[PDB]
């Protein structure tokens, strides 16, 4: 499957595309204002994502940091981002069916559609000034807003037990992108997609 991975923004962002425990494709790559990457997904992935990450700082060999999204200091990302990171989910050829999903359960740094290419379904976006927005305690200085797990580290936050349920801090996220998930147990927002299908994931989004 392809995914177009687009930058509309004023600023750089260095796009990332990982399963976990290995890269998608290259896994990542610098995407100035204006530039796109198209990616090949295989068929079956599941558990996969696509972020940005900002302000990075890498060197000759690809090794450094990024002020949101880093990826083991990495360039080509093989596992996933540091908080806060708006992320693009999927998993593909699930019982004949993709399944599509925008989350902020890992915080939220760059706004971003998820669309397939078909007319088949329809795409998900979470593209409100949430940065802008962010309570002070969920401020990332870094750039972007924190998840309220990552922040405070306790069950109420992070659905480690029991069953959790909204919180203010969820239901900040919720609120402004009700189609994108704002913790683990959040009535579902994910698309059904036909089979084998391709996508665009575009950051600043305008359309």
């Given at each position: 499957?392809?995914?177009?991975?687009?930058?509309?923004?004023?600023?750089?962002?260095?796009?990332?595309?990982?399963?976990?425990?290995?890269?998608?494709?290259?896994?990542?790559?610098?995407?100035?204002?204006?530039?796109?990457?198209?990616?090949?997904?295989?068929?079956?992935?599941?558990?996969?994502?696509?972020?940005?990450?900002?302000?990075?700082?890498?060197?000759?060999?690809?090794?450094?940091?990024?002020?949101?999204?880093?990826?083991?200091?990495?360039?080509?990302?093989?596992?996933?981002?540091?908080?806060?990171?708006?992320?693009?989910?999927?998993?593909?050829?699930?019982?004949?069916?993709?399944?599509?999903?925008?989350?902020?359960?890992?915080?939220?740094?760059?706004?971003?559609?998820?669309?397939p290419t078909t007319r088949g379904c329809r795409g998900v976006r979470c593209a409100a000034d949430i940065v802008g927005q962010c309570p002070?305690?969920?401020?990332?200085?870094?750039?972007?807003?924190?998840?309220?797990?990552?922040?405070?580290?306790?069950?109420?936050?992070?659905?480690?037990?029991?069953?959790?349920?909204?919180?203010?801090?969820?239901?900040?996220?919720?609120?402004?992108?009700?189609?994108?998930?704002?913790?683990?147990?959040?009535?579902?927002?994910?698309?059904?997609?036909?089979?084998?299908?391709?996508?665009?994931?575009?950051?600043?989004?305008?359309?």
């Open positions: 499957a392809t995914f177009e991975i687009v930058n509309r923004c004023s600023y750089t962002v260095w796009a990332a595309a990982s399963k976990g425990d290995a890269a998608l494709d290259a896994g990542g790559r610098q995407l100035n204002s204006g530039e796109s990457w198209t990616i090949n997904v295989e068929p079956g992935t599941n558990g996969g994502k696509i972020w940005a990450r900002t302000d990075c700082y890498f060197d000759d060999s690809g090794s450094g940091i990024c002020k949101t999204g880093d990826c083991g200091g990495l360039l080509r990302c093989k596992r996933f981002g540091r908080p806060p990171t708006t992320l693009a989910e999927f998993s593909l050829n699930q019982y004949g069916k993709d399944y599509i999903d925008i989350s902020n359960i890992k915080g939220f740094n760059v706004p971003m559609n998820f669309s002070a305690k969920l401020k990332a200085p870094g750039g972007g807003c924190n998840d309220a797990c990552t922040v405070f580290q306790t069950s109420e936050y992070c659905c480690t037990t029991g069953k959790c349920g909204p919180t203010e801090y969820s239901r900040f996220f919720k609120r402004l992108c009700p189609d994108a998930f704002s913790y683990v147990l959040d009535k579902p927002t994910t698309v059904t997609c036909p089979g084998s299908s391709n996508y665009r994931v575009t950051f600043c989004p305008t359309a």
